Design a protein around this motif. Structure first.
Motif, short mmCIF file in Angstrom:
data_model
loop_
_atom_site.label_atom_id
_atom_site.label_comp_id
_atom_site.label_asym_id
_atom_site.label_seq_id
_atom_site.Cartn_x
_atom_site.Cartn_y
_atom_site.Cartn_z
N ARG B 89 -51.68 -15.42 -1.24
CA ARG B 89 -51.99 -14.60 -2.18
C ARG B 89 -51.72 -12.90 -1.59
NH1 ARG B 89 -57.00 -11.65 -1.78
NH2 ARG B 89 -57.81 -13.07 -0.12
N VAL B 90 -50.95 -12.47 -2.46
CA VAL B 90 -50.60 -11.19 -1.98
C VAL B 90 -51.63 -10.30 -1.99
CG1 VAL B 90 -48.76 -9.31 -2.62
CG2 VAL B 90 -48.42 -11.72 -3.54
N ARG B 91 -51.60 -9.35 -0.76
CA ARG B 91 -52.74 -8.48 -0.34
C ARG B 91 -52.06 -7.03 -0.41
NH1 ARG B 91 -53.82 -13.34 3.54
NH2 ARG B 91 -55.98 -13.88 2.66
N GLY B 92 -53.00 -5.97 0.12
CA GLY B 92 -52.49 -4.79 0.22
C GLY B 92 -52.65 -3.94 -1.08
N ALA B 93 -51.26 -3.08 -1.37
CA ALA B 93 -51.35 -2.31 -2.32
C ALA B 93 -50.84 -2.80 -3.83
CB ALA B 93 -50.32 -1.21 -2.19
N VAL B 94 -51.90 -3.73 -4.31
CA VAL B 94 -51.66 -4.40 -5.64
C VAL B 94 -52.27 -3.85 -6.78
CG1 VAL B 94 -51.66 -6.56 -4.37
CG2 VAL B 94 -53.85 -5.61 -5.26
N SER B 95 -52.82 -2.60 -6.53
CA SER B 95 -53.09 -1.93 -7.93
C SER B 95 -52.48 -0.45 -8.15
CB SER B 95 -54.74 -1.59 -7.74
OG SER B 95 -54.96 -0.86 -6.50
N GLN B 96 -51.54 -0.22 -7.33
CA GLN B 96 -50.76 0.83 -7.32
C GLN B 96 -49.55 0.87 -8.10
OE1 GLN B 96 -53.38 0.56 -4.26
NE2 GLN B 96 -52.69 2.45 -4.97
N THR B 97 -48.90 1.92 -8.62
CA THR B 97 -47.74 2.06 -9.60
C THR B 97 -46.77 2.74 -8.92
OG1 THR B 97 -48.81 1.87 -11.64
CG2 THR B 97 -46.59 2.78 -11.73
N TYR B 98 -45.49 2.26 -8.45
CA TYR B 98 -44.50 3.00 -7.70
C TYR B 98 -43.36 3.32 -8.33
CZ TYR B 98 -47.51 1.84 -3.80
OH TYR B 98 -48.60 1.80 -2.54
N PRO B 99 -42.61 4.29 -8.64
CA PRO B 99 -41.23 4.62 -9.30
C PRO B 99 -40.37 3.67 -9.49
CG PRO B 99 -42.20 6.80 -8.56
CD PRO B 99 -43.01 5.54 -7.78
N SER B 100 -40.31 3.02 -7.96
CA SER B 100 -39.06 1.94 -7.77
C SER B 100 -39.85 0.45 -7.77
CB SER B 100 -38.59 2.29 -6.63
OG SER B 100 -37.38 3.02 -6.95
N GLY B 101 -41.08 0.59 -8.44
CA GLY B 101 -41.72 -0.90 -8.13
C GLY B 101 -42.65 -1.35 -7.06
N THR B 102 -43.14 -2.31 -6.97
CA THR B 102 -43.85 -2.94 -6.02
C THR B 102 -42.95 -4.04 -5.41
OG1 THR B 102 -46.04 -2.24 -7.09
CG2 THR B 102 -45.95 -3.41 -4.93
N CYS B 103 -42.97 -3.99 -4.13
CA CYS B 103 -42.21 -5.35 -3.61
C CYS B 103 -43.09 -6.06 -2.69
CB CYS B 103 -40.92 -4.92 -2.92
SG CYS B 103 -39.49 -4.17 -3.98
N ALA B 104 -42.72 -7.39 -2.26
CA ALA B 104 -43.43 -8.10 -1.33
C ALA B 104 -42.84 -8.31 0.02
CB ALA B 104 -43.77 -9.27 -1.80
N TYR B 105 -43.54 -8.43 1.19
CA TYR B 105 -43.06 -8.72 2.54
C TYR B 105 -44.04 -9.53 3.20
CZ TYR B 105 -45.99 -5.15 4.36
OH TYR B 105 -47.23 -4.40 4.92
N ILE B 106 -43.43 -10.43 4.18
CA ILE B 106 -44.49 -11.16 5.19
C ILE B 106 -44.46 -10.37 6.37
CG2 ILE B 106 -42.38 -12.75 5.64
CD1 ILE B 106 -44.43 -14.82 6.29
N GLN B 107 -45.71 -10.49 6.99
CA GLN B 107 -46.28 -9.87 8.17
C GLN B 107 -47.33 -10.37 8.58
OE1 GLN B 107 -45.78 -5.60 10.05
NE2 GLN B 107 -47.16 -5.39 8.58
N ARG B 108 -47.19 -11.10 9.92
CA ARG B 108 -48.20 -11.70 10.82
C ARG B 108 -48.83 -12.85 9.84
NH1 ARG B 108 -50.10 -7.44 11.94
NH2 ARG B 108 -49.31 -6.20 10.39
#
Lengths: 135, 130
Positions: B89-108
């Motif tokens: 399940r992707v957490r964090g900034a999932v309701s924002q719109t970014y000019p270059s889009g939203t990307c995912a990463y794995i941490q902890r």
């Protein structure tokens, strides 16, 4: 039975030079880390050249964790020996830190952030196993 | 015929590589392609487990090939395939719109959503010669 092609190293290991390297799953005292590698028919990390050193430092650049190596010193009276009974050669590096006679089971060395340190073998840390690459 | 090159990690059907530098999602993708690979794609819970093991000793964020333009688009891997329902399940900034889009990463051990414009290390993967 005889290998169709045979990979240099087993899955999940890292192949570099004439060796395979496996990064520990978690923290274990030195004696146990040793048992883990021996059970795999391998051994704790032994830096025997500059290339090994370059590789390890780079492979451990992403971490701040301590990784046990196969180097120990029973007590001050004794010298620094690798697992195969051989001595620590000068040129490679220096093991800074204390060798306490109060330590339960000698002193062991680990690598962290590129530099090598001494520590009470009884403490837990990640480790690195090593075997010759299948070639 | 060796499965993977030196420094790569051979696991199952693929080879894996941690990047040497921290770049934005676009530059990271460019770097993986340059190595004849692509950004990390998790096809199951076993892939995810292997990944966390390899990344256990690190607290750094690693970009993966998952992204979208904004919250109106679903999460898709580079190849076009969607995100399997029960993987993570992707957490964090999932309701924002970014000019270059939203990307995912794995941490902890967890996956997060972040502005693709930001820097992070990455994991590249390619098919192993079996």
């Amino acid at each position: 039975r005889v290998a169709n092609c045979s990979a240099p190293c087993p899955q999940d290991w890292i192949w570099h030079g004439e060796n395979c390297y496996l990064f520990s799953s978690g923290s274990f005292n030195w004696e146990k880390s040793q048992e883990k590698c021996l059970s795999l028919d391998a051994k704790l990390l032994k830096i025997n050249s500059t290339a090994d050193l370059d590789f390890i430092q780079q492979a451990i650049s992403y971490s701040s964790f301590p990784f046990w190596m196969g180097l120990s010193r029973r007590n001050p009276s004794y010298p620094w020996l690798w697992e195969d009974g051989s001595p620590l050669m000068p040129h490679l590096f220096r093991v800074r830190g204390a060798v306490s006679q109060t330590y339960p089971s000698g002193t062991c060395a680990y690598i962290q952030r590129g530099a090598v340190y001494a520590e009470n073998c009884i403490l837990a840390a990640f480790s690195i196993c090593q075997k010759k690459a299948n070639l």
